[PDB]
């Protein structure tokens, strides 16, 4: 648990590859925000919170299998960019865009977390958390 | 259109139970329901929706004029299939299933050519002019060709709908229809994976009663669909 962000991302990727809709993730401001964003983008069905023994679990419903489990044309990819060993930052004009914009990029900036779209409207650069296909 | 199903009849014929919990495929864990005495109990509220959709597409496909196969190779399911197929006037496989029946058509059809020559031979009465070795040999040809080509011997052309009993033992049928672009409407017990069929109906394996229930429902759908394709063309 040296990195929480990468961990969330990873659990998602694993549950996804295994064709399961439901994931338990540990909550945190970052986690919660990231998931919110993930919802307003439409990458994930629904999110909700649970509590036991002062632990918080966000469970995430995931988009249903593609017209069977066997014949899948599409998966859902996640990639950590800035990680504890190398922190990647970008100014306004270097802000990444994924596959011509089909995917998104998550930024942590002065005004909070957002997508690259929001950064382009508001004109801010910052730290790039991950890429999402 | 409606079909005949209720919780009470499916409770009657014994559809709701399946093989022991040592033997199960967790791939089926989403739509299973309970577990009793180390005997699994499969969800019937899913079973009714799948059986409804199955009889619906069976009705549309019968009405448009498409051709039907049915398959199970078991001991009881074979005696049930000859009669299911005669009652719906369809093509069947009960006895030993030959690899390549669907996928390799050309050689299967030449095998049918020579089986037809054999059917003309035997009724012509020209098997009485032969040495004893020749009649015993032509009778080997006959015995075999009847076993394998018995229920399909009417069909000319590639069958576009296939119906199947218990996909565990039926692997090659599933493979061949997966390959050729054919839909499979299949019976699932707790041991089988729900990849291999287009419409997979949760069902029972060991029971002759479940086989008869779901197969009579389906052959009734094919029968009313047979009235609708006797009308539409």
């Amino acid at each position: 648990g040296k990195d929480t962000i990468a961990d969330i991302i990873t659990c998602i990727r694993n549950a996804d590859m295994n064709r399961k809709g439901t994931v338990r993730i540990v909550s945190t401001n970052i986690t919660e925000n990231i998931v919110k964003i993930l919802l307003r983008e439409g990458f994930i069905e629904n999110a909700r919170k649970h509590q036991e023994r002062n632990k918080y679990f966000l469970v995430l419903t995931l988009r249903h299998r593609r017209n069977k489990k066997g014949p899948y044309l599409n998966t859902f990819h996640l990639k950590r960019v800035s990680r504890p060993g190398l922190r990647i930052y970008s100014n306004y004009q270097r802000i990444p865009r994924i596959l011509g914009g089909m995917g998104i990029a998550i930024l942590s900036t002065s005004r909070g977390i957002m997508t690259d779209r929001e950064a382009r409207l508001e004109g801010i650069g910052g730290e790039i958390l991950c890429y999402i296909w | 259109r409606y079909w005949n199903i209720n919780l009470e009849e499916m409770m009657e014929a014994g559809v709701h139970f399946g093989h022991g919990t040592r033997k199960w495929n967790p791939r089926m864990s989403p739509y299973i329901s309970a577990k009793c005495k180390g005997i699994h109990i499969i969800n019937l509220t899913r079973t009714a929706r799948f059986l409804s959709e199955a009889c619906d597409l069976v009705f549309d496909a019968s009405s448009r004029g498409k051709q039907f196969l049915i398959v199970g190779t078991k001991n009881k399911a074979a005696d049930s299939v000859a009669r299911a197929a005669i009652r719906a006037r369809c093509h069947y496989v009960n006895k030993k299933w030959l690899g390549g029946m669907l996928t390799n058509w050309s050689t299967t059809e030449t095998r049918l050519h020579k089986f037809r020559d054999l059917r003309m031979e035997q009724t012509a009465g020209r098997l009485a002019r032969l040495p004893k070795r020749d009649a015993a040999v032509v009778k080997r040809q006959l015995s075999h060709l009847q076993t394998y080509l018995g229920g399909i011997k009417y069909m000319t052309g590639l069958p576009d709908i296939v119906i199947i009993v218990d996909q565990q033992e039926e692997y090659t049928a599933l493979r061949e229809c997966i390959t050729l672009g054919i839909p499979t409407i299949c019976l699932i017990d707790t041991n089988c994976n729900p990849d291999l069929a287009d419409i997979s109906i949760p069902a029972n394996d060991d029971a002759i009663a479940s086989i008869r229930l779901i197969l009579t429902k389906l052959v009734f759908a094919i029968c009313e669909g047979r009235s609708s394709y006797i009308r539409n063309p």
């Binding site: 983008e41 011509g100 914009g101 089909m102 | 050519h113 003309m120 000319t156």
Partner: protein, 187 residues
């Protein structure tokens, strides 16, 4: 019920003999076959070297429909032919853009062959290496960048290219998946 002899001779006359009927039907399929590679493979027997030809061949309409196929025979011609059929039954479709290029940038992996495709500006032509280039050219992609990294083997690179252009998502469909209007993702 009409007699069995006349109706079974009707299914015998409708399915034609392979010894009395010659074959060229293929240009009516609207396809073109392009031979990528011709190799002489060998099985060895107590007598000596038993020689065969392996042909790797792709088919396309140059209209956005393409496939790969592999075949084996004693003669160049026959293997070519088998390759043709195996390809035709294996065939798929490449997502295209109004300018005849790719939706986006993509990688692919098949065996030790890795393949890099990225969209281009109109008028750049197709720049790539043998397998990837023939596949893409036969698909009809007009402007494409590609480089095979990893291995050089023709066949694997072909299959990898197919894997690439198969996973390509066109914008309409990501709009439909995400559940968001096109113009919102455009920005």
């Amino acid at each position: 019920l009409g007699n069995d002899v006349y109706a079974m001779d009707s299914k015998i006359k409708k399915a034609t003999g392979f010894g009395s009927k010659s074959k060229k039907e293929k240009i009516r399929d609207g396809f073109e076959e392009n031979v990528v590679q011709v190799r002489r493979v060998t099985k060895v027997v107590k007598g000596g070297k038993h020689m065969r030809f392996r042909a790797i061949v792709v088919v396309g309409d140059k209209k956005g429909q393409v496939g790969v196929g592999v075949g084996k025979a004693k003669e160049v011609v026959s293997a070519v032919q088998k390759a043709a059929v195996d390809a035709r039954r294996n065939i798929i479709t490449v997502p295209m853009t109004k300018y005849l290029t790719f939706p986006h940038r993509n990688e692919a992996d098949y065996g030790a062959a890795r393949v890099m495709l990225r969209p281009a500006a109109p008028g750049t032509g197709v720049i790539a290496g043998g397998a990837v280039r023939t596949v893409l050219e036969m698909a009809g992609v007009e402007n494409a960048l590609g480089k095979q990294l990893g291995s050089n083997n023709a066949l694997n690179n072909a299959r990898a290219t197919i894997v690439a252009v198969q996973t390509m998502r066109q914008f309409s469909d990501v709009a439909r998946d995400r559940g968001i209007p096109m113009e919102e993702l455009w920005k």
